[PDB]
A = this chain, B = another copy of it.
Amino acid sequence: MDPYKEFGATVELLSFLPSDFFPSVRDLLDTASALYREALESPEHCSPHHTALRQAILCWGELMTLATWVGGNLSRDLVVSYVNTNMGLKFRQLLWFHISCLTFGRETVIEYLVSFGVWIRTPPAYRPPNAPILSTLP
């Protein structure tokens, strides 16, 4: 299984964006709760993105519970710094991808990814002054 192969993208595509680019897990969860809480809590799925987001949120909750359990044991404050960079980055990327695809669509996200990669790899002098942004014009 590949988390993004179903949705066109690949982990290889998302990995070339800077790691610090993705907003923290708390921010992504806040955006999800603000925007699609009723959709995620709906009995019916109506999209692969909603199902994937539900599974990701449940797995993140399970991992946080396991981390809290480990911290309760006994050192244990270094495994929490381990999870936020190894698994934390992966969950951050997955949640950002799914939330952005729900908001702006899969395509817009794919071209935003490729354009932002090209931009960040382009030398600044021969580059647009402002980084590409995922948004909608009035």
Contacts and interface: CB of A to CB of B under 8 A. Distances in A.
A112 to B, nearest CB: 10
A55 B55 contact: yes
A45 B45 CA distance: 14
Contacts of A2: 41
Q: How many copies does the complex hold?
A: 3
B122 A23 contact: yes
Contacts of A13: 34
List 3 tightest A-B contacts by C-beta distance, closest first. A59-B59, A55-B55, A27-B121
Interface of A: 1-3, 5-6, 8, 12-13, 16, 20-23, 27-28, 30-31, 33-35, 37, 40-41, 43-45, 48, 50-52, 54-59, 62-63, 65-66, 69-70, 73-75, 78-79, 82-83, 87, 90, 103, 114, 117-118, 121-123, 125-131, 133
